Design a protein around this nucleic acid. Structure first.
Lengths: 244, 211, 147, 121
RNA sequence: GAUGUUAGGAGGGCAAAUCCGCCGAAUUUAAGCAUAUAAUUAAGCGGAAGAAAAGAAAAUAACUAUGAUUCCUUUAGUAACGGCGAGUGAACAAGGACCAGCUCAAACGGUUAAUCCUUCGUUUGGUGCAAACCUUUCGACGGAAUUGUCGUUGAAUUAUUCCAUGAAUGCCUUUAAUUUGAGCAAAGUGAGCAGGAAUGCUUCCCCAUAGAGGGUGAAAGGCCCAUAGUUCUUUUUAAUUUAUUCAUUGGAAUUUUUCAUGUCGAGUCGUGUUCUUUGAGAUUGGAGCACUAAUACGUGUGAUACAUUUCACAUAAAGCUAAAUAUAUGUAGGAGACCGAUAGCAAACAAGUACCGUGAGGGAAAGAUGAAAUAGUACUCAGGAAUGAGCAAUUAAAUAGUACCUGAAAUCGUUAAGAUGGAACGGAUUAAGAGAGAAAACAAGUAAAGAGGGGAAUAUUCUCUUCUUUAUUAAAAGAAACAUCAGUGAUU
RNA sequence: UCUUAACCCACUCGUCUUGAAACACGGACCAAGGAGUCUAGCAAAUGUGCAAGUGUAUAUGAUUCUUUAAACAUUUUACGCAUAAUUAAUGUAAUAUGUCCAUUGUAGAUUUGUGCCCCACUUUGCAUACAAUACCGGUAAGCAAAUGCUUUAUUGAGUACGAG
RNA sequence: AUACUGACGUGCAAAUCGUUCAUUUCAAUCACGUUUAGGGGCGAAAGACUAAUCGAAAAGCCUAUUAGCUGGUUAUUUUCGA
RNA sequence: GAAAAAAUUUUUUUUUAGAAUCUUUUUAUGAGUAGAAAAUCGUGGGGUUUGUGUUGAAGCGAAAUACGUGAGUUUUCGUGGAACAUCUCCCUAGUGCAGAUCUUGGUGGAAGUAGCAACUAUUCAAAUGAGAACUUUGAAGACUGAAGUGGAGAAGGGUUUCUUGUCAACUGUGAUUGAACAAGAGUUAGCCGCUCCUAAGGGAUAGCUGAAAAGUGUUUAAAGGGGUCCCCGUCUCAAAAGGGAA
RNA sequence: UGCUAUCUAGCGAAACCACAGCCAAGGGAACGGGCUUGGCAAAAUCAGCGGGGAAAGAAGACCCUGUUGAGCUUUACUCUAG
RNA sequence: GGCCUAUCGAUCCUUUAUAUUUGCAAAAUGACGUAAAUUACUUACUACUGUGCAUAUAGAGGUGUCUGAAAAGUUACCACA
RNA sequence: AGCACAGUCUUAACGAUGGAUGUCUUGGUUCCUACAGCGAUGAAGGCCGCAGCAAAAUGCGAUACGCAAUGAAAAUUGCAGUGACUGAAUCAUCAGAAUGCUGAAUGUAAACUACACCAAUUCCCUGGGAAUAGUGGUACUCCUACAGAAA
């Protein structure tokens, strides 16, 4: 509040009568009177620096950097070891990226989705998600941040026929359109290696998007993927080698 | 001021704290603008609400190469098109009254653009099922089969946007068709130098003409 | 931001890095740039010499677009041409490339650099340097004054 | 969830809960219907009325059936005949029961109830 | 021009966050101060609106030019201004949002003002339950105005092509959006355990296009309201669908050919001067005063005073106009990486209150029993009474009894232990007391009989295991002590 | 562990001040609250992405609509800053063109060879330092029939295979 | 309201109380109503007074004015250190 | 890549390191205000991860053969009864107090002390009541001493009045008293005042200035009275002690 | 002599307060209640009193200082009502 | 320049010197110069082009509290840090 | 039924005292979205009333914690009291009716319930009969119309 901590008139009767030299509230019979008026040490004294909307809350996050983060997170999501490290219960999964047919995109009901997750082998993951409904502590509660849940599958879809409506209202599971990928969904808490479930439609569209077939409207305009500084990270194989 | 620090150039000595504004409405404002124009177009039967500008030259030494959307076609271009001012208001072409239509090349280009629009345009019957030939160089009233068939299709609104220009301009020329004769630096300096002599001559010409 | 600050390093330290003897108070030479020439003359002379005085006539409304100047050197003139196209010109002795520098955005061509010997090129521009002109003639190219 | 018309805050819902008009008070004085009756009426839950016969399913008083005496809209408590309690001075009153804790057996039929049942089915 | 309680009307005042006018400072900065700075800011007095004002060229350019307004991005911390010190500081272009035009006035129309209004009336429609609104042409009777209302936008004249027009019959079909209030709205109040009582724990079920939210005797998708989803009814505004004949009157646009080439706002511009202001600089805008113009081949502009001449561009001194844009006040929503009762609005509350001040004014302190008081202290005894106690008594719980959650520290009381010759405490090192402890601070395995648990073989045979219990052999571990070395001293 | 003892040692803390145990100043006590922040612009540092470009501005677009107030996209000469300096200023403006090679030195990282590997010669020779030449804008001086010239001076934040 | 520089001096009182003393028919005293307002008033002049306020009243604001000056300026270890 | 012990070659018992800000090893070094750096530890919130909850957590007091150089951390018992963490990683901040004649709130020592000293004085008996120096009644003694602690009225206050109850707190002692608290009751006008009249005064009309706000007030007026259509005329409030019927 | 003080019954504060509370000498910021060395030093109190606590108080009214002021004056500077 | 060691002064401003160097913002002011042409807005070619102001470079005019405020008294009425 | 030393200081235990801490939270907070003027046809503000038992903020205005109407719709309840088995008891909506005295405040006034002047006024009945001292109007400026006066 703009006027807070300063609206009162203020007075100074203590200098020449042995009371400390901070301003005092004027008046008589009210028990505010003769009390310390304002200043950051005082009751009613307000902030030392009043907060204002001048504050640099946002940031410019750069286009090339944004693209790199999405691509690299998708590549990280690829890696099986990273998926497990991220805490996904990977044991009964049957491919390194999890890829399902076109036929996924039409699935219609929460039970069918659960059945599909069980069929994949994510029953244990679904169990961890169910378990992970817990009350978030402290003042968050009073600000309507009541429960915290954990993050399981990210479903990447093209067709809108069923999956969009079906995987909606599944605790801990996220959805994204192939064009409109989100780094916040791909890497929660900035954590690399989220469990990604793709439609074949989505997977094929992805390949098109970041260069293939040269599709004029689907491709990102003259975009070029980044390349690693190290050509092959197996350093110990270099060490092992005969020349070395 | 101290050490290696540059002199400041801030103007925060005046009471700026009640003369400052921070934009938190941007993306929602953009959404509202989109919603407003979308609602308007839909209310107009989905018919175009877009305005077709003349192509006009960007000014002075810096921008003379470039060309942009202008205020309005104005009478000479409209007369060349065969369109009335009233028609120009009635249809989507941009309107004016004091933009002169200048040089031949610009006028010829804009009448061609008008002609392109005029050929393009199809006009819905005024009263529906009481079709007429009608006024202003506006198209005669559309038949019922065609207009319905056309309504189902997208409108073609490409011509509204600015056009592109020659992609390579790297063109070949044979060695014996060019020469080494030229003195461009000399030509420039001489041209500026001889301006005074010409200006004086031209003033005398202008006096003679006026006489 | 708040958790890495110098105040967090010095949190219980009284004056706290600003001098116990000093007892830290705001702008104690006077405000802003104001002590320049008077009290900060040594700083201004040593770090910003040509600051004080009045130099030159005035031009009341400059209008910077009137005198606008986008330049290229002859060195980078060939660089406006693609590699494969340039190879074709290198191969074919009988032809030269026309380059419209203004259509590529430039008005003046300056004389820094090298033009490859025995290799005609046609350069179209509003302005050329004396050196640029000399190089274009020397290599058997042509210069076109163009508006 | 999806509608942005109504608040998802704790704060508004509570205020609405305390400041209720009578129809709202009636809504949050509804009880679940008996199983064959739910099939009969095509209705999960019904607003309590004076001469209704409820069964208690919760608290220390669970498993007791009985007629409703008085309904207290203000404290949101129904009173039932066989849930008596003596007070500090030995006066007998009925224990007030929140309507969440009871399942309705025989609803009272009346013209207003008939209209409600006709509306529901 | 007076006068009228003549008949009909209007204004006044309030509210102010944003808006528009006036009028209009200083603290402050320069480390002093005077010009500059704060700042054309605050206060003052006025006017408006849901936005206002501004706006259709007396404009910008010098290009291959642009072409009403507003707004943004920018130019630009730049040209420029400045005790050229401190300091101040635009506009045009370009990219965009968004874009809308126009009419008085002269001029033109006299075998007729073709105008305008009040009062009296009168009928072709349409709603609504009813109030009542809404369309609708036709006559009077009064006035007003020629000191100029209405029509016209050079003038006729040709061909083309539209619009108003009136009557009869035909016809109001279908949807799509859009937006209100409305409704309906999935599965368990299933075992068992401990529990004051589950929404807990298990365990057997499930539902989700609803696992947002709230309430519900402890954390609820299945207890309730709600939610997601839908069924309508409401707003308007699109598409679709249907018109056909018969009838006058009038207007408009182009297009020919002739003919008319007329016109364009004065104590205003301008200039001088003064004071103010700005970017304006030998004067940018304002204002006072003095002198005071030209008529469209004029005169106003083209940022350094001037003369003399170009050329480009505009048309002042009359007027209006939607949109984008702004909004800290009132009301309504929705919010949060906000505060959590000394904070957050002064105010979580019977607070703009109490209370204080002659008055203008100044202005607080101030939330929580329990699931349930339709569980709020019954009863008895001792008391003048307050109260107290109880074999008596609610509650799961009363050192939970309404000055009721939790109940810190300061402070003070009771009991016990210690201390005590002008301080008090401390450090370092032991001591005696007073407490506490077995987790390294001893005891593996073996046999006996209790309690559990597992694995294998083809629901139960085989077999592997850990704790209690009786006693029965190991052992290791530390502390001592001496000897033995190696390092380092001292001794004779 | 707590508790007194006892030997030896033990001056009110904070504070400004050269200097406080002070006859210097503040502090009866306890609890809670209580002071280098935020914005603007700039700089160096270090990370990160790209590189002679870079940022995507206002804004548009979408099969984007609890969380979405973000995220995603942008049908080849817009603008900021950097790609050139100089200068009151009309202006002018970077090897010099016989060569796709590509300024001169001296140290100097790196490389060939000889007599695993340090080596001792040679061999090749970046950054960088110290110099040097060139050459461009300014200014002189000398000339000047204007494609202004001229070895020589001087001067700029210059330039001599771009770094932002 | 002269003196006792009386009592009082955490008062009976933010100027009281006791005793002494001046005044008492006029430039007298008292009431009520009324006038003159802040760089202003008013002043038998003392810069007096103008509501426990005066060499410039009270209220609110510019304002969180400004202060080279006074005071204060908050967990730990390690390193270099004037 | 095998070392030891216990058994009776074979059984049993212990161990068996490869995480670059990392592990092993060696030597040197170790002062410190103002000041600079790094490593830490804690608080509020956020994302993330995987847990803790009424077979009682947080919180709080007292502790612990506890761990850490340290800030701290961890834990026990007691109280307590609802929400609590993240060291896995990383963001963010109204983020760490002994002190400011700090702010605010509570509280002590000073201390059962200073003190309850203006104003000549009370006694006896009785009654009431739980209880009487200071309530009531009586008897005495006294005092105020008509410039009265007596009557009346103005200002100002406002049910303080009065009866009937009455004693939680108040009535700076006591208290049954009360100007405290509770329930009621009560102020009667042709003639008494106000009300009316004008004054010192104030506010306006008429004007005129001033951007307005205001500054002025018959002063460049076509204006309330009496008359058989004529003759006169600025208004208005202002005295509870002037004038003023009874 | 009165009224107080005094003692009881009753009611019942405040200022002040780093921690405190015997000296002497020494050194020391050059005059110590605490420090070093000496003298010494044995509970608890009641009534007083003024040697000390460089006693209490009020951010030295004195003096000096500030590129803080304010008041006043002139033939100080710059204006200005008249 | 004075036998040596002394004999002196920023920015802004004013002023006079100096220039085949410049500017006053769409243009011009020598000079219609020199040629041709002749219906005319002809066509070439020319280092030297009005008043006034601004610059640029070089001095001088001064600041002696001399690395540069345009600045007298007074307070025993006084206040504050 | 004995025995303690006192006082002062310290320790532990247990209480008083106090209101911190912790936990809440129908409140604040900032932002975004959305609509957005009232008044002589008497606003805002202010008084004075009005509850069965009723003081208060709240609510309402002499018909006064509501009247009527609509949509919900069976209770109400501290006591008394009022209804149901659907214009009743309860809510919400709220368009009809009602809205004291004031206040720009406007008949002259104002520390006044003081004071003018012109209309006397209202109801009931079907073209008449009854009641009541009651109720209105009458400010200042402007405008249009009319009037009778003044060129």
């Amino acid at each position: 509040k703009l006027g807070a901590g300063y609206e009162t008139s203020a007075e100074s009767w203590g200098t020449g009568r042995a009371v400390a030299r901070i301003p005092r509230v004027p008046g008589g019979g009210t028990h505010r009177a003769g009390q310390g008026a304002f200043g950051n040490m005082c009751r009613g004294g307000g902030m030392f620096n009043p907060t204002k909307i001048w504050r640099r809350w946002g940031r410019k996050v750069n286009l090339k950097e944004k693209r790199y983060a999405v691509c690299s997170s998708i590549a990280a999501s690829g890696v099986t070891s990273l998926v497990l490290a991220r805490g996904h219960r990977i044991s009964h999964l049957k491919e390194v990226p999890l890829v399902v047919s076109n036929d996924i995109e039409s699935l219609s009901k929460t039970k069918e989705a659960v059945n599909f997750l069980v069929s994949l082998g994510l029953k244990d993951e679904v169990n961890r998600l169910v378990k992970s409904k817990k009350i978030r502590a402290g003042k968050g509660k009073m600000r309507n941040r009541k429960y915290k849940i954990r993050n399981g599958p990210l479903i990447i879809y093209e067709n809108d026929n069923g999956v969009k409506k079906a995987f909606r209202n599944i605790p801990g599971v996220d959805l994204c359109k192939v064009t409109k990928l989100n780094l916040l969904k791909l890497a929660p808490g900035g954590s690399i290696g989220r469990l990604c479930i793709w439609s074949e439609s989505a997977f094929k569209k992805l390949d098109v998007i970041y260069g293939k077939i040269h599709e004029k409207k689907v491709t990102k305009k003259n975009y070029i993927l980044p390349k690693s500084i190290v050509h092959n990270p197996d350093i110990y194989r270099i060490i092992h080698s005969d020349k070395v | 001021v101290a050490h290696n620090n540059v002199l400041p150039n801030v103007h925060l000595h005046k009471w700026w704290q009640h003369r400052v504004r921070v934009n938190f409405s941007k993306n929602i404002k953009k959404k509202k603008r989109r919603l407003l124009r979308e609602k308007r177009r839909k209310a107009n039967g989905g018919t175009p609400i877009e305005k077709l500008h003349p192509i006009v030259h960007c000014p002075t030494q810096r921008y003379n190469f470039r060309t942009r959307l202008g205020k309005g076609f104005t009478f000479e271009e409209l007369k060349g098109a065969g369109l009335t001012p009233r028609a120009a208001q009635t249809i989507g072409i941009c309107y004016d009254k004091r933009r002169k239509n200048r040089s031949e090349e610009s006028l010829t280009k804009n009448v061609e653009r008008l002609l392109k629009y005029k050929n393009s345009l199809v006009m819905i019957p005024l009263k529906k099922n009481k079709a007429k030939k009608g006024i202003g160089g506006i198209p005669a009233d559309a038949d019922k089969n065609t207009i319905k068939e056309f309504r189902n299709k997208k409108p073609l609104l490409s011509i509204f946007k600015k056009e592109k220009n020659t992609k390579p301009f790297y063109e070949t020329i044979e060695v014996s068709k060019i020469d080494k004769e030229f003195l461009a630096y000399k030509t420039l300096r001489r041209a500026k130098l001889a301006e005074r002599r010409k200006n004086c001559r031209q003033q005398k010409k202008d006096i003679k003409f006026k006489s | 931001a708040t958790r890495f600050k110098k105040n967090r390093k010095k949190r219980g330290h009284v004056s706290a890095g600003h001098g116990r003897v000093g007892k830290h108070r705001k702008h104690p030479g006077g405000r802003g740039k104001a002590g320049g020439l008077h009290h900060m003359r040594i700083n201004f002379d040593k770090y910003h010499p040509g600051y004080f005085g009045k130099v030159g006539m005035r031009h009341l409304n400059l209008l910077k677009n009137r005198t606008y100047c986008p330049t290229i050197n002859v060195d980078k003139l060939w660089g406006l041409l693609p590699e494969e196209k340039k190879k074709e010109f290198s191969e074919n002795k009988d032809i030269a490339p026309v380059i419209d520098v203004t259509r590529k955005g430039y008005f003046k061509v300056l004389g820094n650099g090298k033009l490859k010997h025995n290799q005609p090129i046609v350069v179209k521009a509003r302005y050329f340097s004396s050196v640029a002109e000399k190089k274009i003639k020397a290599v058997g190219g042509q210069c076109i004054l163009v508006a | 969830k999806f509608n942005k018309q109504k608040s998802s805050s704790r704060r508004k819902m509570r205020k609405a809960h305390f400041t209720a008009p009578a129809g709202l008070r009636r809504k949050i004085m509804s009880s679940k219907l008996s199983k064959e009756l739910r099939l009969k009426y095509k209705t999960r839950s019904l607003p309590v009325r004076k001469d209704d016969e409820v069964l208690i399913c919760r608290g220390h008083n669970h498993g007791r059936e009985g007629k409703v005496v008085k309904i207290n809209r203000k404290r949101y408590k129904i009173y039932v005949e066989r849930v008596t309690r003596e007070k500090v001075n030995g006066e007998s009153t009925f224990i007030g029961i929140h309507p969440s804790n009871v399942v309705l057996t025989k609803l009272k039929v009346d013209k207003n109830r008939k209209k409600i049942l006709d509306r529901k089915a």
